Amino acid sequence: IKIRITLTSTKVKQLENVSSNIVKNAEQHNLVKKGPVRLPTKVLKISTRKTPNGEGSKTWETYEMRIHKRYIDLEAPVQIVKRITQITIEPGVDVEVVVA
């Protein structure tokens, strides 16, 4: 049935809580799976002058957004799949499931 679930958040511990509760659900239902593949986090850098105006010493500022991405592949019936998507959601965490 071969679903993938990807989790593409910024909050690492919320993300890991979601991954953890999902995998323990998987093993209590006895579902084989490829474990949490932790993709390389990607750092949206933005470099700007601190100043609005032009004068001053040329001081710069690198703001960063860390995006942490994980995914898990499951083999399971669609009933457990749909209730899985019904459960295991958090604030500040974007999830998407995909079949095949």
Partner 1 sequence: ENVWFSHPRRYGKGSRQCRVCSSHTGLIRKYGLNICRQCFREKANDIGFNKFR
Partner 2 sequence: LISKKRKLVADGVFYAELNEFFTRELAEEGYSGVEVRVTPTKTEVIIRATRTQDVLGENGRRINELTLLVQKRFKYAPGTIVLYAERVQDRGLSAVAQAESMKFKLLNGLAIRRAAYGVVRYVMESGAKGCEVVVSGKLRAARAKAMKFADGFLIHS
Partner RNA sequence: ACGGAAGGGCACCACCAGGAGUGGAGCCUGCGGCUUAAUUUGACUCAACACGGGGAAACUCACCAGGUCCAGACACAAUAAGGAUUGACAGAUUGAGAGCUCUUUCUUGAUUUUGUGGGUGGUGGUGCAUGGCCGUUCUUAGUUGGUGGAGUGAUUUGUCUGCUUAAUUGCGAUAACGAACGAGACCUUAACCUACUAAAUAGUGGUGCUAGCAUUUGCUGGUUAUCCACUUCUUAGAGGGACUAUCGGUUUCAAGCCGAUGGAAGUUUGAGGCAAUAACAGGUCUGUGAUGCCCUUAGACGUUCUGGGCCGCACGCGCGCUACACUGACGGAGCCAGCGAGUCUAACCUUGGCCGAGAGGUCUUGGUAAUCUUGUGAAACUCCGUCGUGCUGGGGAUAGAGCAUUGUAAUUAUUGCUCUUCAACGAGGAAUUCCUAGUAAGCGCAAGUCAUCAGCUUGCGUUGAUUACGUCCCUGCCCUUUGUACACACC
Give me the residues that bind partner 2 (CB under 8 A), please: 8, 10, 42, 44, 65, 67, 69, 85-86, 89, 91, 94
Give the distance, in angstroms, between the CA of residue 20 and the centroid of all CA atoms in the same chain. 12
Q: Which is nearer to partner 2, 8 or 17 (CB)?
A: 8
- If binding is defined by CB under 7 A, does position 86 make contact with RNA? no
Q: Are 5 and 72 in contact (CB under 8 A)?
A: yes
Cβ(66)–Cβ(87) below 8 Å: no
Q: Which amino acid is it at 98? A: V
The binding track of 16-35 with respect to RNA, each residue x by CB under 7 A or -, is x----------------xxx
